[PDB]
C-alpha cells in the first residue's frame, strides 16, 4: 500500500583475473504518499533482487516531511556530496515542477505544489540525497513558535 519509484538502474563491474564481474544497483524511492518518505539504495547481481533490497532499505529508512497543505512550508536549499537542490513552495494551482530524481522523491513524499531546481552535480544519487537533505532542513510553524514563543508571530493564512 506504498508508493515505490525506482529512479536509476546502472550496471557496475569489477575486474578479476578472468574478466569483468557485473552487478546491478537500483536506487529506489518509497513513501506512503501522504507525509512520509524513505530512500534505499540496494544492489545485487540481478535487477529484481537489487530493486527488492532497495525497497527494504527505503522502508526501513522512512522519515517524516513537514507539509502545510500540499506544499512545503518555506524555501530550502539542500546539499549532498556535490548536488545542490532548491525547493520553493507554490500556489495550489501549480504542479510539481522538478527534474527526474527530485520529482520522484517529492511525488512519493506526497507533495503537490513545489518548484525544485538542481544546481550542482547531475548524478541521480546525489540529487536524491540533496533533496532529502533539504526536506530535513524544512521546519514547521508549530515548533519554530515553540522554540521562540507566543505562537502567532508568523503568517498562517490558510491553516485548515
Amino acid at each position: 500500500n506504498y508508493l515505490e519509484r525506482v529512479v536509476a538502474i546502472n550496471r557496475v563491474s569489477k575486474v578479476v583475473k578472468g574478466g569483468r564481474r557485473f552487478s546491478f544497483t537500483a536506487l529506489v524511492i518509497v513513501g506512503d504518499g501522504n507525509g512520509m518518505v524513505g530512500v534505499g539504495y540496494g544492489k545485487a547481481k540481478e535487477v529484481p533482487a537489487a530493486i527488492a533490497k532497495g525497497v527494504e532499505e527505503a522502508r526501513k529508512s522512512f522519515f517524516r516531511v513537514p507539509l502545510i497543505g500540499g506544499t512545503i512550508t518555506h524555501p530550502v536549499q539542500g546539499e549532498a556530496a556535490a548536488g545542490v537542490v532548491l525547493l520553493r513552495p507554490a500556489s495550489p494551482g501549480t504542479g510539481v515542477i522538478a527534474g527526474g530524481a527530485a520529482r520522484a522523491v517529492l511525488e512519493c513524499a506526497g507533495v503537490h505544489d513545489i518548484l525544485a531546481k538542481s544546481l550542482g552535480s547531475d548524478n541521480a544519487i546525489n540529487v536524491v540525497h540533496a533533496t532529502v537533505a533539504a526536506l530535513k532542513l524544512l521546519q514547521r510553524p508549530e515548533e519554530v513558535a515553540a522554540r521562540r514563543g507566543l505562537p502567532i508571530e508568523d503568517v498562517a493564512p490558510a491553516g485548515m
Binding site: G93, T94, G95, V96, I97, H112
Partner: peptide
C-alpha cells in the same frame, strides 16, 4: 487536470 499542467512546463 494536474498532468496537463506538468506537460506544459
Amino acid at each position: 487536470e494536474q498532468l496537463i499542467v506538468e506537460y506544459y512546463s
